[PDB]
């Protein structure tokens, strides 16, 4: 054991686990999931007395883990066992594909109005417990290059046209589970080389949510240290879940 020295003490024996996940989606205009996956890591912050034998347990085999590497300290069989390094460290890393919760659904509508206007309406739907708040929401809607001007109306949030980036950017501070919001935009067009079709790129989203899209859930973290005169009941334990978008594109 060259990751942990030997004579460590704390009055207050406490650990913290952070489940951190990226959720990636590509969706067809109809509503097919063309591709989706989740990448995750568990980080541990441990203030435990001595040299303890810990046993981590989650709802494995219930969700399905395609593959996962571990940290040196991990003894391999068939559940997870280790003596943690003190302070903060990455315990495991993992990937997921099956039975993913997709926190948001995006429904685009587009209509051409002669050669002069584009009519665009996008709806977002939150798909998770109403107890829970998504935050830092962005919806990115692309605009053509012959764009003269853009009008938006949105009842929730704020939105501005970013001519430099060729995109309408809609931002929302917080939104609760099982809910609906929509933006309307009218895009004014300059005339153009006639046989330019618009390659309508996807509408993309960013968001953060307080749960693991993978479905993963922490079940126990058991600490035993045989010499010293604390037990398991004496340790204070916490989890938090932080789920964030990676590539989250819906094709309009």
């Amino acid at each position: 054991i060259g990751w942990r020295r030997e004579g460590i003490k704390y009055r207050r024996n406490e650990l913290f686990l952070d489940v951190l996940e990226s959720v990636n989606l590509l969706m067809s205009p109809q509503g097919q999931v063309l591709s989706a996956h989740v990448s995750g890591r568990v980080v541990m912050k441990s203030y435990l007395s001595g040299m303890p034998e810990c046993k981590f347990g989650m709802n494995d085999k219930s969700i399905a883990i395609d593959d996962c590497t571990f940290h040196q300290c991990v003894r391999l069989s068939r559940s997870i066992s280790f003596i943690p390094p003190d302070g903060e460290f990455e315990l495991m890393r993992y990937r997921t594909t099956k039975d993913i919760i997709l926190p948001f659904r995006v429904i685009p509508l587009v209509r051409e109005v002669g050669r002069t206007k584009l009519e665009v309406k996008v709806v977002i739907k939150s798909n998770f417990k109403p107890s829970l708040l998504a935050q830092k929401i962005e919806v990115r809607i692309p605009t053509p290059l012959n764009t003269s001007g853009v009008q938006v109306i949105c009842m929730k949030g704020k939105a501005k046209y970013k001519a430099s980036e060729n995109a309408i950017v809609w931002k929302i501070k917080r939104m609760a589970g099982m809910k609906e919001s929509q933006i309307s935009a009218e895009i004014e067009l300059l005339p153009t080389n006639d046989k330019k079709k618009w390659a309508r790129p996807p509408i993309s989203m960013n968001f953060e949510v307080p749960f693991a899209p993978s479905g993963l859930k922490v079940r126990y973290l058991k600490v035993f240290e045989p010499k010293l005169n604390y037990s398991d009941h004496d340790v204070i334990k916490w989890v938090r879940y932080i789920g964030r978008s990676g590539i989250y594109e819906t094709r309009c």
């Binding site: 913290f16 307080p210 922490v218 079940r219 973290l221 334990k237 916490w238 989890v239 938090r240």
Partner: peptide
Amino acid sequence: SYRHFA
């Protein structure tokens, strides 16, 4: 948000 396990 840092909650106990159960």
